[PDB]
Amino acid sequence: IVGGYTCGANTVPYQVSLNSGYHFCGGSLINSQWVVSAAHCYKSGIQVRLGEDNINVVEGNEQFISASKSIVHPSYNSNTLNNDIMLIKLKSAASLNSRVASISLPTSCASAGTQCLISGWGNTKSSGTSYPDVLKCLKAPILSDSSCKSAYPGQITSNMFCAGYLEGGKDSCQGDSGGPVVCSGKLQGIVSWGSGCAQKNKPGVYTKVCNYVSWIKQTIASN
């Protein structure tokens, strides 16, 4: 997250870190057994880390649970990033509490202008590199589909939306991928892609979760 703030420990209780020896992507806890992330984050050998603030220090509220299964969306295209969503099942159920909590799925799509919370452990610099230990947060609005398409000609599908600031300076970034965009208490987006980070006229692009609720629910119900 570039241009954001320190969230505070366990203030974003649905945020998870995906770990394969090292943090590599975010995700969102949607029930005791299942995490939502980006398909481009797929790899084997995932350990889900819940209850994290500093990802390099054991602070006392963590739950580390290995994934048993991951399910990339059936129509994910890694070239275009269309349908950049995947589900990860935990080998054992998380113990839900005030600091480890699921986030609700939306019932309707969000609108441009809605303010959302974007979070992660990704790069905090737009020109260099600096990776934080503690969770960072950014409040940002959803942008109009016409502004989004104009920013990224030929690249924005109906399964994507833009959020952020056209002036630059405030965005998600590498290492935030897979993490949440939460608006009014609902998971509306997944950190997906962008041109660099925090660049003028190049807002963040997010997977549009509302399009996937029926796939998420039916997949969980049979897996």
Residues belonging to the binding site for Ca(2+) are: 52, 54, 57, 62
Matching residue, tokens 């947060």: 137
* Residues 122 and 1 sit within 8 Å (Cβ to Cβ): yes
Helix (H) or strand (E) holding 145: helix 145-151
**Catalytic, out of 40, 53, 176, 192:** 40
Q: What is the DSSP letter of 60?
A: S
Catalytic residue among 84, 102, 119, 192: 84
Least distance (Å) from Ca ion to the CB of residue 55? Answer: 6
Token code pair at residue 71: 């399910």
Stretch binding Ca ion (CB under 5 A), from 7-15, 58-66, 119-127, 142-150: 58-66
Closer residue to Ca ion (CB): 59 or 145 = 59
Q: Which amino acid appears at position 23 of this protein?
A: H
Assess whether 40 carries a catalytic annotation. yes
Residue whose C-alpha is closest to residue 72's, from 56, 58, 57, 83: 83
Instruction: Say which residues have a Cβ less than 8 Å from residue 99's Cβ, sequence separation at least 6.
Output: 10, 13, 51, 61
- 40 three-state secondary structure: helix
- Nearest distance from C-beta of residue 9 to Ca ion, angstroms: 9
Region binding Ca ion by CB under 5 A among candidate stretches 19-27, 59-67, 179-187, 194-202: 59-67
Active site residue 133: no
Judge whether 176 counts as a catalytic residue.
Answer: no
Q: Which of 17, 28, 119, 177 is catalytic?
A: 177
Considering the complex, state which of residue 60 and residue 169 has its C-beta at the smaller distance from Ca ion. Answer: 60
Strand partners, 86: 37, 72
> Is the CB of 54 or the CB of 147 nearer to Ca ion?
54
Question: Considering the complex, what minimum distance in angstroms separates the CB of residue 87 from Ca ion?
Answer: 24
Question: Least distance in Å: CB of 190 to Ca ion?
Answer: 23
CA-based nearest residue to 120, from 203, 201, 3? 3
Which range binds Ca ion by CB under 5 A, 48-56, 97-105, 159-167, 211-219?
A: 48-56
Token pair for residue 9?
A: 């420990």
Contacts with Ca ion, residue ranges (CB under 5 A): 52, 54, 59
